[PDB]
Write a protein that binds this ligand. Structure first.
Ligand SMILES: [K+]
Ligand SMILES: [K+]
Ligand SMILES: [K+]
Lengths: 97, 97, 97, 97
């Protein structure tokens, strides 16, 4: 189909974004007055919180670039998740018959 | 129906996730350099904030596992709530006649 | 209509929740080891952040009850806003002709 | 069309809100007991976090007005993003034929 397949697949996109932003924000903060976004195994848990947009505050970028990577990893979530909602929004309309 | 019943019921699923993650993240952090996620009556209020994805920051996991439980209790919310939006999105289309 | 009127009106409901939770969480925290949720003009800005679910962390309840009021003022937002999305989701389908 | 064009365009609205709230919250906090919302290049990253509603906590307004600008820059996001979800919700229904 699409509405049901454009989603199940997109997520496989967000996950890339995560791992992508993770091992990129680090190399953007690793050397500077910034928080623990100086470790790959740390950026991960950050990508996730950011992507889910929960913002624990426990971690965040301070590097101009690191902040960019944040924005990206953000929409990725607001978006990657939106589709899943879209998918469901129609699969509830697919019961109009 | 479905669109209107697949929701009212799913929530009864998220609530399980809460209580589920609550009394699981604790036993994952209870003994370690981590925050108050060392008390069941505390993990709760955390499951909720996390699930609603508000991330007060007042509490969060530091245990690799405790972080997993977080992720889970997270989607549960982004999702459990999405349906409710889906439900409503169609119940507004159910006025096309 | 509905999809377009059930929303514009619901918000007038959330706003009540705000002012409602505001001047209720205070009288729940006002006298205790809790944060500034001890002032009505402060609970407001909290209801808002909470309702929008942004969780600055700058403020939060510590009173068991105050935490309840939080939950409420939370869904109110996840929900009150969901409808508005629902409304829009259909007003985009109302262009199928 | 609309559902697909009312979105791609709205965002160009939120971005204005950002830059708009950015260089406005500052001049509202710049001179007071408030956080770094005293620098334009700082308010930005705040508008974004706020707009995405992630609330890192790293920054927030304390000025009554600065708090207003927050609210605004908030809905702008909850809303500007909602449409995009709406758009997608229908573009999944546009496969009912
Ligand atoms: K959020
Ligand atoms: K948040
Ligand atoms: K926070």
């Amino acid at each position: 189909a699409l509405h049901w397949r454009a989603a199940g697949a997109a997520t496989v996109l967000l996950v890339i974004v995560l791992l992508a932003g993770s091992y990129l924000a680090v190399l953007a903060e690793r050397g500077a007055p910034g928080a623990q976004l100086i470790t790959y195994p740390r950026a991960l848990w950050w990508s996730v919180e950011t992507a889910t947009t929960v913002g624990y505050g426990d971690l965040y970028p301070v590097t101009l670039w690191g902040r960019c990577v944040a924005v990206v990893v953000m929409v990725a979530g607001i978006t990657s998740f939106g589709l899943v909602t879209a998918a469901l929004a129609t699969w509830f309309v697919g019961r109009e018959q």
